[PDB]
Amino acid sequence: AREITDIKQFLELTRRADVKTATVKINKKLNKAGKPFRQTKFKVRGSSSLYTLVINDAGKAKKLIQSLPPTLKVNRL
Amino acid sequence: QNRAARKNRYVERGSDVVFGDQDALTASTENGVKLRQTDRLLDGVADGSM
Amino acid sequence: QKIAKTFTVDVSSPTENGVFDPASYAKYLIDHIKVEGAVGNLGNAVTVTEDGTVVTVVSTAKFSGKYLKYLTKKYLKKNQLRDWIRFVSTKTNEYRLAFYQVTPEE
Amino acid sequence: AAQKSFRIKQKMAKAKKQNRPLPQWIRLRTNNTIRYNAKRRNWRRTKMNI
Amino acid sequence: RAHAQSKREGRHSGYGKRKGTREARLPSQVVWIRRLRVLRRLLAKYRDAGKIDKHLYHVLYKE
RNA sequence: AUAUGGAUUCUUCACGGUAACGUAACUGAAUGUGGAGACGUCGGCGCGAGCCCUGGGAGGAGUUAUCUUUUCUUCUUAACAGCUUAUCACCCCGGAAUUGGUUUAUCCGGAGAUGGGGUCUUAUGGCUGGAAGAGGCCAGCACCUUUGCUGGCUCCGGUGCGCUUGUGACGGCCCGUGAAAAUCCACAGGAAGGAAUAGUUUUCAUGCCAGGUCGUACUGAUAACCGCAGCAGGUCUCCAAGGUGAACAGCCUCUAGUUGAUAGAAUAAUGUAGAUAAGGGAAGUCGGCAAAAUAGAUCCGUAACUUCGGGAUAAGGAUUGGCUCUAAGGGUCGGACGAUCAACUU
RNA sequence: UUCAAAUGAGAACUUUGAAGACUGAAGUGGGGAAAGGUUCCACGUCAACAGCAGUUGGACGUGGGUUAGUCGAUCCUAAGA
């Protein structure tokens, strides 16, 4: 497994054309120790390794789901 | 109690009528084996007299 | 600073049958609870208040859900209601007395 | 043992298949001298010495 | 726990209860090494904070 | 096997840092040289892991004649990957007697110490990915069914001459100085090979294909091995909880595992194993044989002889429970003191 | 060691439950090497064996069960052959 920070690098992996399936994941966590917030994790099945991208904000998460290609298979939770 | 007692009791199905008193359809063969299995004592001889 | 903690014991299924009563239970709690030593000190650290369906206790002072469960089973043994009633948590700080399984006789 | 040769294993296999009592259809034959299996083995009683 | 709590107070400690040599109970070398390290790093922080000078530090180190 | 991406090249075979060295890359045949593989035991000292001990909160179980904010239990995180981290060692600046630094252990410095600023290994630890979807602990519905179905919580800390183990840097020991080879890598060398209209790099990245043969159950012993046996015998090794205590001694417990050894009824003599005994105290016996007595720890004290190391725990004395106190012995941070946190020794 | 129920013609010895104890992490625990070779597990079943018994079994009868690029062997050398 291999984390990615950058958003541009994730969009390259989706167009790489070995990646048959992706999967989205949603987790409840608590920031600092103040309040809850809804994390997301966009994982993508490479041939060798599993690349993943942790987005904390819920607003940026929902635009990212649309920003995936339609031809790629996507799988919720 | 009486709510439970009137809920729990049963219609008695068809299988109870035919197989209440009955038992042992296809009796237990002498080796104690399943239908496809083989038993090399009694594969050779066919019949209970022999 | 101190930050209060509501705890809510339902007693519906015992009370409707009439083995149990909220009034003696709310009477039993309010004296037997201990803060900072010993019994019978508790002005405004806690406030035990029955409705009838649900009993409610709210504590700015040191108090826990296990200590509430402790004092209930202490009370239930006093009435010989252990073996037939048990203290349960449905949600966090949200408790209710439920009868055990109990088969029908017939 | 639990780390056998193939050859040692091969001889256990022959020893397993030989380990059986007499088929009952052989009792019934014309001029049956043979009554029981006289070269039967058991793990406790006799060590096969590989 | 109750026996451990009385041992913290200084109870069940006396000559009757003890069945080991002083070294077996607490080694003499450990008592030295605790002590000598403590006297060492006292003199370290006095030197660098500059209560004591370096010439007197060198004498007290060997003492 | 190759093919795209990146890098490199018209100064063809990368740049940066004073330097230790650094980075995603950054041609290389013969031959040669070097490292890894590659290694004793003992001793303490540091660091890590697992276990032990311990507090708050969220669940579950037991106790409740009287007392107990109580007793027990669950709250977990793999290989692998990417960032980051350490003793030793090394580099630069600078020039030390009024000699300084420093380990539990006294070794180091004009062959350049102390000091200040760096570079490196990544055992090990940390942080995210793996990964909560898993696992664990609870709650509630459907019901002849060989059946599903749905909710929660899974959190935040602390302590140490602790135990087991791994590793580090040191020290002791010898007329003992404690394997080899496969395999892999590096360095020196430069045979030669590559561009300006497109080549060179498959030790950077991603992608494609493939991985045969044989062993794999179970016991490992007061019934599976060897003693003619389902024989009180013999047979190599790993894991290893709580208390008492110096202790992997003995004694009692938790997890796990047994409850197997022909039974029943009486309680004669003689036995086997084990105890006690008035007064005397070896009169017993070939012979104090066998029992008895002594025993742990602390303090006082300790002869002859001696190869000066010993003899020595010589001998011989005074003590030890329980409780409630007093006294001394540390750490942590920010500049004469003050706050706060902890160990079991005397 | 004891009490009940179940099974069965038959129970001091099988099974489940209820009690009382033991081994007491240098184990009557959990895994392996040598050696054994199916003893593992299920169903059926008691003539003989289990120095009493037996409905029980490592017994008797019939079956099922051991899946590897990564754990081993294979490869390397040791004393030696």
Swiss-Prot record, chain B:
Localization annotation: Nucleus, Nucleolus
Superkingdom in the source lineage: Eukaryota
Residue(s) carrying Phosphoserine: 15
Similarity annotation: Belongs to the TRAFAC class OBG-HflX-like GTPase superfamily. OBG GTPase family. NOG subfamily.
Subunit structure: Associated with nucleolar and cytoplasmic pre-60S particles. Directly interacts with RLP24.
Other comment: Present with 28000 molecules/cell in log phase SD medium.
Function: Involved in the biogenesis of the 60S ribosomal subunit.
Protein name, UniProt field: Nucleolar GTP-binding protein 1
Organism this protein belongs to: Saccharomyces cerevisiae (strain ATCC 204508 / S288c)
Gene: NOG1
Complete-protein stretch covered: 549 to 598 of 647
UniProtKB/Swiss-Prot annotation, chain C:
Record has Ribonucleoprotein as a keyword: yes
Main location: cytoplasm
Pfam family, one: Ribosomal_L22e
Keywords: Cytoplasm, Ribonucleoprotein, Ribosomal protein
Statement: the UniProt record of this protein carries the keyword Ubl conjugation: no
Source species, domain of life: Eukaryota
Xref: Gene3D superfamilies: 3.30.1360.210
Subcellular location: Cytoplasm
CC terms in the record's Gene Ontology section: cytosol; cytosolic large ribosomal subunit
One GO biological process term: cytoplasmic translation
An MF annotation (GO) of this entry: structural constituent of ribosome
Biological role stated in the UniProt entry: Component of the ribosome, a large ribonucleoprotein complex responsible for the synthesis of proteins in the cell. The small ribosomal subunit (SSU) binds messenger RNAs (mRNAs) and translates the encoded message by selecting cognate aminoacyl-transfer RNA (tRNA) molecules. The large subunit (LSU) contains the ribosomal catalytic site termed the peptidyl transferase center (PTC), which catalyzes the formation of peptide bonds, thereby polymerizing the amino acids delivered by tRNAs into a polypeptide chain.
Similarity comment text for this entry: Belongs to the eukaryotic ribosomal protein eL22 family.
Subunit architecture: Component of the large ribosomal subunit (LSU). Mature yeast ribosomes consist of a small (40S) and a large (60S) subunit. The 40S small subunit contains 1 molecule of ribosomal RNA (18S rRNA) and 33 different proteins (encoded by 57 genes). The large 60S subunit contains 3 rRNA molecules (25S, 5.8S and 5S rRNA) and 46 different proteins (encoded by 81 genes).
Other notes: Present with 60400 molecules/cell in log phase SD medium. There are 2 genes for eL22 in yeast.
Swiss-Prot record, chain D:
Comp. bias (Basic residues): 6-19
Protein source organism: Saccharomyces cerevisiae (strain ATCC 204508 / S288c)
Pfam families for the chain: Ribosomal_L39
Lineage top rank: taxon: Eukaryota
Segments for region (Disordered): 1-21
Coarse class of the protein's main subcellular location: cytoplasm
A GO term for molecular function: structural constituent of ribosome
Name this polypeptide is given: Large ribosomal subunit protein eL39
Subunit record text: Component of the large ribosomal subunit (LSU). Mature yeast ribosomes consist of a small (40S) and a large (60S) subunit. The 40S small subunit contains 1 molecule of ribosomal RNA (18S rRNA) and 33 different proteins (encoded by 57 genes). The large 60S subunit contains 3 rRNA molecules (25S, 5.8S and 5S rRNA) and 46 different proteins (encoded by 81 genes). eL39 interacts with YIH1.
Gene encoding the protein: RPL39
Keyword terms: Cytoplasm, Ribonucleoprotein, Ribosomal protein
Gene3D superfamilies, alphabetized: Ribosomal protein L39e
SUPFAM superfamilies, per database record: Ribosomal protein L39e (SSF48662)
Swiss-Prot record, chain E:
Annotated spans, Disordered: 1-22
Subcellular location per the Swiss-Prot or TrEMBL entry: Cytoplasm
Modified residues (Phosphoserine): 28
Superkingdom assignment: Eukaryota
Job of this protein: Component of the ribosome, a large ribonucleoprotein complex responsible for the synthesis of proteins in the cell. The small ribosomal subunit (SSU) binds messenger RNAs (mRNAs) and translates the encoded message by selecting cognate aminoacyl-transfer RNA (tRNA) molecules. The large subunit (LSU) contains the ribosomal catalytic site termed the peptidyl transferase center (PTC), which catalyzes the formation of peptide bonds, thereby polymerizing the amino acids delivered by tRNAs into a polypeptide chain.
The protein's assembly and partners: Component of the large ribosomal subunit (LSU). Mature yeast ribosomes consist of a small (40S) and a large (60S) subunit. The 40S small subunit contains 1 molecule of ribosomal RNA (18S rRNA) and 33 different proteins (encoded by 57 genes). The large 60S subunit contains 3 rRNA molecules (25S, 5.8S and 5S rRNA) and 46 different proteins (encoded by 81 genes). eL19 lies in close proximity to the binding site for eukaryotic initiation factor eIF4G.
Misc. comment: Present with 97700 molecules/cell in log phase SD medium. There are 2 genes for eL19 in yeast.
Family the UniProt entry places it in: Belongs to the eukaryotic ribosomal protein eL19 family.
Stated name of the protein: Large ribosomal subunit protein eL19A
